[PDB]
Amino acid sequence: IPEMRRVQQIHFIGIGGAGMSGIAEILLNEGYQISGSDIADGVVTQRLAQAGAKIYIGHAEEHIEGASVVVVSSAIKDDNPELVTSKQKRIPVIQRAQMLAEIMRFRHGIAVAGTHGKTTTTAMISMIYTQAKLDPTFVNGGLVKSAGKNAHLGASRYLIAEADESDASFLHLQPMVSVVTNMEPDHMDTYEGDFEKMKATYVKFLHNLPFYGLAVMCADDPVLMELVPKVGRQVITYGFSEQADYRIEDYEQTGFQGHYTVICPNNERINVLLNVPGKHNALNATAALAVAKEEGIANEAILEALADFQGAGRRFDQLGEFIRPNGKVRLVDDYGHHPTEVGVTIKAAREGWGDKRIVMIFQPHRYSRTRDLFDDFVQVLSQVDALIMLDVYAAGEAPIVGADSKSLCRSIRNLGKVDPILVSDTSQLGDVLDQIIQDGDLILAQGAGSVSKISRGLAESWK
Ligand SMILES: C=C(O[C@H]1[C@H](O)[C@@H](CO)O[C@H](OP(=O)(O)OP(=O)(O)OC[C@H]2O[C@@H](n3ccc(=O)[nH]c3=O)[C@H](O)[C@@H]2O)[C@@H]1NC(C)=O)C(=O)O
Ligand SMILES: [Mg+2]
Ligand SMILES: [Mg+2]
């Protein structure tokens, strides 16, 4: 891995970002001087600063002093003072994915793309390669829990990276192996409502593979299977489908572990214990197993990693067990924010929780999304046994009338399967929970916004 010519200091605008911070950590550990700004100081920025990155909170033209190159998050606005000034001083300004691509350039890149499951799959592959003693570099879009970080620099040529389709930015990447987990409507503003344009973009992405490259694609996704003829690279499939190259059979969930068999292309049978719940994770783990098997990694390494898998951050993220005045409860944090993904989480919980109650704390992310998927939210949220609603996490959006938490609560109440409690002052969340808790409750803190931080504050106080 060569040093980049004349690159002394790399400045990140929005350095606390999930993807931004991983790249900064890689480059810091490679020996580059790292600076960055963010509007918020948290665990991520504190870790980077402690490691030796120069972090500023707030944006100012002075923050870019000394930068050889500026890396910008998609979250950053065009009026940002650091961004405007960087261009004025003729300092290269590049997107996050272009810098990830440079990390990938001289590495054996395994890019994990798809709508859902990318963070878990990337973590799984990372852990398999680690267990195989291959000492991979990885850059994930969320925590690899066993690592306690989103990214890690290994001494090998291997790179496992989550590949973001959301701005077509994964087109910068030049991988050796590309996983596509699935394809569903998301980030449609970048694709202008056109599902076909997204389809074309994924095909374009797979065309970045070398002629000898490998695409590992989910056999259970009809859209992905229709795209196989257009790939023009070797395609290996995985899933429950009888036509899958790596076929999952005999799946059972016991508690929060999965048990199943994978039948490989040469009919080799592999009995898997997977340390995370749900058929959806069996799929993610079979993408990971397929990648590893195709790379030549021994079953021992694959099985050990999957059996010990500690999960990805906020993906059915077990926060612990707590004795409360009204019962012993289990708290779990999950990122799921689309109705189908919230449904998957509820299913995984149900299949591990027997006859005990599932209590959900749900925070809708965006008024726009709440508006657009309102009825679907009403239906999926109505599946839980007790429901606490938090106010919509606006993420910069102006309120939309009829698309707030009060409106969701009304509609759910009126459906009559569950009677939701709206909690606006989240300092009261623990008290509301304490009032309604029963022994053996599973409490699912659900959503993409501040709900995770709120749930961890709750956990901490309950310790
Ligand atoms: C788009 C997704 O989310 C992720 C994706 O998972 C990962 C990995 O691929 O790369 C991107 O993270 P990222 O590291 O660029 O940024 P995010 O994790 O969204 O956070 C943005 C960061 O910018 C900061 N920020 C935002 C606005 C601002 O004016 N100033 C500022 O400093 C925020 O405080 C935050 O710390 C994607 N986010 C965006 C906005 O592009 C997705 O997965 O669908
Ligand atoms: Mg996404
Ligand atoms: Mg019910």
Torsion sign across C-alpha atoms 184, 188, 191, 197: positive
340 is in an annotated binding site: no
Same domain, 37 and 119: no
Mark whether 189 and 257 lie in a shared domain: yes
Pocket residue to mutate for ligand 1, from 13, 164, 198, 314, most atoms within 8 A of Cβ:
164
Active site residue 162: yes
Six-digit token pair at 321? 């067990």
Q: Are residues 77 and 109 in the same domain?
A: no
The token duo for 404 is: 């707030």
359 and 381 Cβ atoms separated by less than 8 Å = no
* Shared-domain flag, residues 60 and 106: no
- Order of strands, edge to edge, in the sheet holding 421-423? 317-324, 327-334, 442-446, 358-362, 386-390, 421-423
* Distance (Å, whole) CA 181 – CA 50: 35
Nearest-atom number in ligand 1 for the CA of 73 is: 15
Residue 186 CA to ligand 2 center (angstroms) comes to: 7
Residue 137 labeled ligand binder: no
Give the total number of structural domains in the chain: 3
Q: In what order do the strands lie in the sheet with 137-144?
A: 149-152, 137-144, 158-162, 108-113, 177-180, 214-218, 234-239, 246-254, 257-263, 269-274
Angstrom CA distances, 96 to 5, 27, 89, 118, 383, stand at 19, 12, 20, 17, 38
Distances (CA, A) of 11 to 30, 33, 44: 15, 9, 16
Packing angle of the helix pair 405-415, 374-381 (nearest 10 deg): 50
Characterize the bridge pairing of strands 317-324 and 358-362: unpaired
CB 384 within 8 A of CB 346: yes
Alpha-carbon 373 to chain mean position: 21
Point out the ligand 1 atom lying closest to the alpha carbon of residue 45: 36
Is there a domain that residue 216 lies in? Answer: yes
Does residue 118 carry a catalytic annotation?
Answer: yes
Residues of the domain holding 434 = 313-463
Amino acid occupying residue 259? H
Sign of CA dihedral 197, 199, 202, 208: negative
SS3 380: helix
CA 72 to chain centre: 20
| Same domain for 422 and 444 | yes
On whether both 152 and 287 belong to a single domain, the answer is yes
Q: How far is the CA of 113 from the centre of ligand 2 (A)?
A: 9
Q: Which of residues 295, 312, 329 is at a domain's end?
A: 312
Quick check: is 2 in a domain? no
Structure tokens at 366: 């965006």
Q: Is 460 known to be catalytic?
A: no
Structure tokens at 104: 């990938």
Do 102 and 76 have their domain in common?
A: no
**Which CATH number does the domain housing residue 376 bear?**
3.90.190.20
CATH number at residue 16: 3.40.50.720
With the C-alpha atoms ordered 163, 165, 169, 174, is the resulting torsion angle positive or negative? positive
Look at residues 253, 285, 312 and tell me which one is the last residue of a structural domain: 312
Locus of tokens 């790292």: 34
Structure tokens at 130: 């680690």
Total residues found in the chain within this entry: 463
List, in sequence order, the alpha helices (H) in 70-210. Answer: 81-88, 96-105, 118-131, 195-206
What residue ranges line ligand 1, CB within 6 angstroms? 14, 16-20, 38-40, 73-77, 96, 141, 162, 164, 166-167
Tokens of 447: 């959503």
> Do 81 and 100 share a structural domain?
no
104 closest CA partner among 24, 12, 175: 175
Report helix, strand or coil for 113: strand
CATH code assigned at 162: 3.40.1190.10
Does residue 24 belong to any structural domain of this protein?
Answer: yes
Q: Establish if 132 belongs to a structural domain.
A: yes
Torsion sign (Cα): 220, 139, 59, 80? negative
Residue of 82, 85, 102, 119 marked catalytic? 119
In order, the DSSP letters of 57-104 are ES--GGGGTT-SEEEE-TTS-TT-HHHHHHHHTT--EEEHHHHHHHHH
- Nearest protein CA to atom 21 of ligand 1, as residue: 17
Same domain, 136 and 252: yes
Distance CA 12, CA 23 (A): 9
Q: Mark whether 89 and 113 lie in a shared domain.
A: no
Residue 28 · residue 54 · CB < 8 Å: no
